Design a protein around this ligand. Structure first.
Ligand code: NA
Lengths: 10, 125
């Protein structure tokens, strides 16, 4: 899938 | 567009029935998850347009999010706790069946689900 990417959770 | 209308949040012809369990689900369970630093991706329906996700609603047939659950609780949509718990479970399931294991959103859902289960274990009688 395309995916939602980074969410800056470290 | 890629996005459907959001789920319904009012239950037609349903009598109002307040319970300690439903109060707990809104004021303890939903509120605790809502304030968490990882809640934001789950506070509204997945916006496949604004996120450029043409595949999301191809894969997810039963959309659910905490904004919808919140409004359902506020509108007394659920007859009992199990119906509300089922919607939380659907929200987490959708995340885990769409997104690749290990992705940040999956780790965020995992964290929220742990808190969810901890709170549900203390549902009032
Ligand atoms: Na989800």
């Amino acid at each position: 899938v395309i995916g939602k990417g980074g969410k800056n959770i470290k | 567009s890629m996005n459907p209308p959001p789920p319904e949040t009012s239950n037609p012809n349903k009598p109002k029935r307040q319970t300690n369990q439903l109060q707990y689900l809104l004021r303890v369970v939903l509120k605790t998850l809502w304030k968490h630093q990882f809640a934001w991706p789950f506070q509204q329906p997945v916006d496949a347009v604004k996120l450029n996700l043409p595949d999301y609603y191809k894969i997810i047939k039963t959309p659910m999010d905490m904004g919808t659950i919140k409004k359902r609780l506020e509108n007394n949509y659920y007859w009992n706790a199990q119906e509300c718990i089922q919607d939380f479970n659907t929200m987490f399931t959708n995340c885990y069946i769409y997104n690749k294991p290990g992705d940040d959103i999956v780790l965020m859902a995992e964290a929220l689900e742990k808190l969810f289960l901890q709170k549900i274990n203390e549902l009032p009688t």
